[PDB]
Design a protein around this nucleic acid. Structure first.
Ligand SMILES: [Mg+2]
Ligand SMILES: [Mg+2]
Ligand SMILES: [Mg+2]
Ligand SMILES: [Mg+2]
Ligand SMILES: [Mg+2]
Ligand SMILES: [Mg+2]
Ligand SMILES: [Mg+2]
Ligand SMILES: [Mg+2]
Ligand SMILES: [Mg+2]
Ligand SMILES: [Mg+2]
Ligand SMILES: [Mg+2]
Ligand SMILES: [Mg+2]
Ligand SMILES: [Mg+2]
Ligand SMILES: [Mg+2]
Ligand SMILES: [Mg+2]
Ligand SMILES: [Mg+2]
Ligand SMILES: [Mg+2]
Ligand SMILES: [Mg+2]
Ligand SMILES: [Mg+2]
Ligand SMILES: [Mg+2]
Ligand SMILES: [Mg+2]
Ligand SMILES: [Mg+2]
Ligand SMILES: [Mg+2]
Ligand SMILES: [Mg+2]
Ligand SMILES: [Mg+2]
Ligand SMILES: [Mg+2]
Ligand SMILES: [Mg+2]
Ligand SMILES: [Mg+2]
Ligand SMILES: [Mg+2]
Ligand SMILES: [Mg+2]
Ligand SMILES: [Mg+2]
Ligand SMILES: [Mg+2]
Ligand SMILES: [Mg+2]
Ligand SMILES: [Mg+2]
Ligand SMILES: [Mg+2]
Ligand SMILES: [Mg+2]
Ligand SMILES: [Mg+2]
Ligand SMILES: [Mg+2]
Ligand SMILES: [Mg+2]
Ligand SMILES: [Mg+2]
Ligand SMILES: [Mg+2]
Lengths: 386, 110
RNA sequence: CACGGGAGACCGAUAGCGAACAAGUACUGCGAAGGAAAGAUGAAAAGAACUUUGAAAAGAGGGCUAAAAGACUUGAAACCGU
RNA sequence: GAGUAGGAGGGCGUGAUCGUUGCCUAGAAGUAUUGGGCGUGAGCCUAUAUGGAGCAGCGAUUAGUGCAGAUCUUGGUGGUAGUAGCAAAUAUUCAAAUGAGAACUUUGAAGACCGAAGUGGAGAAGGGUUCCAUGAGAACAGCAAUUGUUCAUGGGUUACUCGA
RNA sequence: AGGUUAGCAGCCUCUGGUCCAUAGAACAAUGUAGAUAAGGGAAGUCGGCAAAUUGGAUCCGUAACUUCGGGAUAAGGAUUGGCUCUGAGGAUCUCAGAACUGAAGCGGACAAAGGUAAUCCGA
RNA sequence: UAAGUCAGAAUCCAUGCUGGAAAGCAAUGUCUAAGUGUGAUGAUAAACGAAAAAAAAUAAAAAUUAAGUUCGAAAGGUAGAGCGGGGAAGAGCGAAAAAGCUUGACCUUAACUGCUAAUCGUAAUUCCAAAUUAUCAUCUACGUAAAUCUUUUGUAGACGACUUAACAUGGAACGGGUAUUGUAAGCAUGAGAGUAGAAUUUCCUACGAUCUGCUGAGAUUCAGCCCGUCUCCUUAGAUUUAU
């Protein structure tokens, strides 16, 4: 039988097998094409998913349905506290592929990062890096860096997510490789060195109206029936075993089931590299103004009234992206630059922000600020304080 | 360490502890929950639930359970002939008007 | 066929009458009628005194006896543990 | 010097009978063998261990005389497998007591059900001691049990007017 | 037996009986049973299978057809609580009025028909 | 088009992306108690120079047809000699799988000289090197780092697994915030269709659904909300790897 009516297949094979991921923070298995063009720049950065809100902007984009009008768009806020830089890593090109030549550690590696090497810090004598400390010889380090200059193709910085800046349970930092793209190996190295034992800010990396990539883990949905997993059409509701099955696992020949036919299994907790997310804002955890606009002219912090649900208050700096990104609130994410710098329209679009909603998300909120709720109910907390 | 007779007043939150438990099993499960809080706190594998406390848990039937209980945890020397643990914990029902001010505390001399 | 006698190039406990035995029995079927399984401790009970650990079964000591042969002669195979 | 169907000639191994030659409480038969050998092969001899009363050769006589099968008979055992499963009939909980041991026994304290078309009180048919009391090892009561419709021991069924 | 009720229905109770159905914990897929889905409204399917709608009582209103019995709850349209008063039916418990009051709800659970027009059989 | 060249597809290969127990590899943190500890027995699809570094070109060149080369090669001893051979430390260089090359305390050895070879009886592997590693036995060290279970989190979950915490930035309880419902109980010398009684004759009293004020109240709100806390519980035990 030639199958009766032809419809497309029920999942993308490039997304299988469907099992869970080993990579918990993002893993970029490519860093953007390297160009000699520009001084060495830092390739990606790490952040955490805080919440969503909506925005009212005005569109200058010409030819669009929306030219010169107000649009409201969904937005995700990602808290981006400063990353620390710990080490440098040289890579050699070998006929079997790239290889790690060496890692240059600083003198300063703070306890929380050391936590990485341990399952529990406090029941341990905390012996990590001791020998690197007592034996530390700046000369040797310089020698290693010179080494890297001599033999190396690629240079990456070993980077430090400082978790102590957030309020979450996990205090144990994150240890990343962030590759360095810049013209000459030597300068890459110089740069890397300049970085050691210092703190890097998201501004250093990402700009506004810049296009982003987000790397991370989908929310885990556990063991999934076939309908939820690949979205098969459900069988006739009259069906004897049950209807949430696929009807035919396969034809007689071949004598087995192909890897292509959908089946039960795990859905969720995969790694995704999502491309071309726009940066609507980058803001400093210092501005109490950071959530407001030229159009607003009043104090606003991005943190929604009653705080981001299942996340917290955002005291640190942040990036605010157009739309949604992978994973549940509090999932760390790696924001990487676009493999090739994006030249298309949406990427050129200059963004004019008018409203940023600070309204509570725990319910349907009508108050943008405590001051508002209070004026409304005639309770002054500044009055109760007095 | 020495292990001494102890007593501690605490509000168990049944709304929380029993949350989303199947109806026919709520009340009973409230009890197991109390009993476990006894164990974790006093470190006694012998816990005893006072009649009154039980009565109060069940005072609303199985489905709908009082949302808070003020309890006293007594730790006492096990003076029995057959003696397994040196100690046992009595869970006692304390009557309250408003639970709203309460903390977990060492029972106070009155 | 019944009660007796004696015998056999019969059979020898899945054989020989169905029944070596509380066998036309136990058991089944409204009923007419159906109908099995089941023999061997040792010469002699001498059938395991007593000590010990166990709530108890039982174990470990200790003993009977030519031997534990101990719910019982020999003790194969399949299967199972070391 | 091939060989199915088939036929012929020799031989191996098993009861019992008439002979003949013998072996065994100084250990027969049977049984186990990674002990030693004999036959091309049916099969044989020995050794060691176990066993504890009968055996064996040779010549003939006779046959209920050789099994891998027949969805073969009867009996005994595997893998599946500590798997399928133990989910109808709304429900249980606390303290004390008893016991080696208590979610499953007894008292009390709570919460629910049958809701007088009953999960109540009594009969006919059918059952036949299942009734009562005391006691209780195993088995049975598909978890459990200190409990029982189970086991052991004793005891219970009174009529002129009920029925035959 | 009581309450509700047309009711020996259902639902809830008192007398009497019972908690006996192996248990604990997690809470995935698939399932068994139970419900609810914005917009459309059988496009699903051999087929409206299944589900949904309807449902009591009082007042209105009620066709063709016909064996004049029927059809007939035809079809269809309204009302239903609470509270404060008023009048009528009887002996030596029913019925009707008026006013006020609520998120215009009120047979609030329980109980409880979906219609219509044709064709074929068999009275 | 035969050599030789350009253009050139939703194709192919890559790039990007998901796996990646490929019984693949690298960089790095800490630890491996005590010694470049010894003894005996063993195994390794293959030890007896199992010897050996130009690069490139095959229609090149002035000129060489074969690794059909070159180097090493003496007694599986002793005593001297010493051409020569091998190398500590440290300092140099060296990365495609860092294999090693230089220097160098020092360690060693060939000609030549003397002993020693014979009875291993006319053969029977010429049992010795190098790189690895198993087992048993023992001497010294009785330590160090880390993990797991009994906890914890819900960013995960059928169970394992996973993210994360470890005397408190944890868990409990509580305070505040945010939010849902929609104005709780109790009062009222306030309103309320209308009725009854007293009272005195333009009222009092009782009953009364409901309205109104106190009241945008009351209740609930992490068990997978947010912020915070004086208080309470967790400081123990067992196990595993290098041993
Ligand atoms: Mg296709
Ligand atoms: Mg790559
Ligand atoms: Mg989807
Ligand atoms: Mg099935
Ligand atoms: Mg006891
Ligand atoms: Mg006792
Ligand atoms: Mg014994
Ligand atoms: Mg014997
Ligand atoms: Mg075996
Ligand atoms: Mg015979
Ligand atoms: Mg003898
Ligand atoms: Mg013979
Ligand atoms: Mg013997
Ligand atoms: Mg013969
Ligand atoms: Mg046979
Ligand atoms: Mg056979
Ligand atoms: Mg079987
Ligand atoms: Mg079943
Ligand atoms: Mg019953
Ligand atoms: Mg009865
Ligand atoms: Mg009775
Ligand atoms: Mg269960
Ligand atoms: Mg719908
Ligand atoms: Mg319609
Ligand atoms: Mg509609
Ligand atoms: Mg139907
Ligand atoms: Mg009529
Ligand atoms: Mg009608
Ligand atoms: Mg009609
Ligand atoms: Mg009315
Ligand atoms: Mg009226
Ligand atoms: Mg009205
Ligand atoms: Mg209605
Ligand atoms: Mg119809
Ligand atoms: Mg009919
Ligand atoms: Mg080309
Ligand atoms: Mg193709
Ligand atoms: Mg009043
Ligand atoms: Mg609270
Ligand atoms: Mg819970
Ligand atoms: Mg908190």
């Amino acid at each position: 039988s030639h199958r009766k009516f032809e419809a497309p297949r029920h999942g993308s094979l490039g997304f299988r097998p469907r099992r869970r991921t080993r990579h918990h923070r993002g893993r970029c298995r490519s860093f953007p094409k390297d160009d000699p063009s520009k001084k060495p720049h830092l390739t990606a950065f790490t952040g955490f998913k805080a919440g969503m809100t909506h925005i009212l902007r005005e569109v200058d984009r010409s030819g669009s349905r929306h030219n010169k009008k107000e649009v409201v768009e969904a937005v995700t806020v990602i808290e981006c506290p400063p990353m620390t830089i710990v080490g440098v890593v040289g890579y050699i090109d070998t006929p079997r592929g790239l290889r790690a030549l060496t890692t240059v550690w600083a003198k300063t590696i703070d306890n929380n990062t050391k936590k990485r090497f341990y399952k529990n810090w406090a029941n341990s004598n905390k012996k990590a890096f001791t020998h690197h400390e007592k034996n530390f010889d700046q000369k040797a380090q310089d020698l290693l860096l010179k080494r890297i200059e001599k033999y190396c193709s690629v240079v990456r910085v070993i980077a430090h997510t400082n978790m102590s800046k957030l309020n979450l349970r996990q205090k144990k930092n994150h240890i990343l490789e962030i590759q360095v793209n810049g013209g000459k190996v030597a300068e890459k190295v110089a740069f890397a060195k300049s970085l050691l034992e210092k703190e890097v800010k998201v501004d250093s990396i990402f700009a506004e109206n810049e296009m982003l990539d987000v790397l991370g883990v989908t929310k885990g949905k556990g063991f999934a029936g076939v309908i939820k997993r690949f979205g098969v059409k459900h069988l006739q509701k009259k069906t004897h075993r049950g209807y949430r099955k696929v009807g035919c696992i396969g034809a007689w020949h071949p004598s087995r089931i192909r890897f292509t036919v959908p089946r039960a299994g795990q859905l969720g907790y995969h790694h995704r590299t999502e491309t071309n997310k726009k940066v609507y804002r980058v803001g400093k955890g210092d501005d109490a103004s950071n959530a407001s606009t030229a159009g607003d002219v009043t104090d606003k912090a991005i943190t929604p009234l009653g705080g981001f649900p299942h996340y917290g208050v955002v005291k640190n700096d942040f990036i605010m992206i157009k739309g949604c990104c992978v994973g549940p609130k509090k999932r760390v994410l790696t924001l990487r630059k676009s493999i090739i710098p994006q030249t298309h329209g949406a990427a050129k679009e200059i963004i004019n922000l008018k409203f940023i909603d600070t309204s509570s998300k725990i319910g349907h909120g009508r108050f943008q600020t405590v001051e508002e709720k209070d004026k409304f109910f005639g309770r002054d907390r500044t009055k109760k304080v007095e | 360490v020495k292990q001494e007779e102890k007593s501690i007043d605490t509000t168990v939150n049944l709304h929380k502890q029993c949350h989303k438990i199947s109806f026919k099993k709520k009340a009973p499960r409230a009890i197991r929950e109390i009993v476990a809080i006894a164990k974790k706190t006093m470190g006694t594998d012998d816990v005893r639930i006072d009649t009154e406390l039980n009565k109060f848990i069940w005072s609303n039937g199985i489905r709908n359970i009082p949302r808070r209980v003020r309890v006293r945890l007594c730790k006492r020397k096990n003076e029995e002939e057959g003696a397994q643990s040196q100690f046992y914990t009595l869970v006692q029902h304390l009557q309250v008007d408003s639970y709203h001010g309460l903390l977990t505390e060492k029972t106070k001399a009155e």
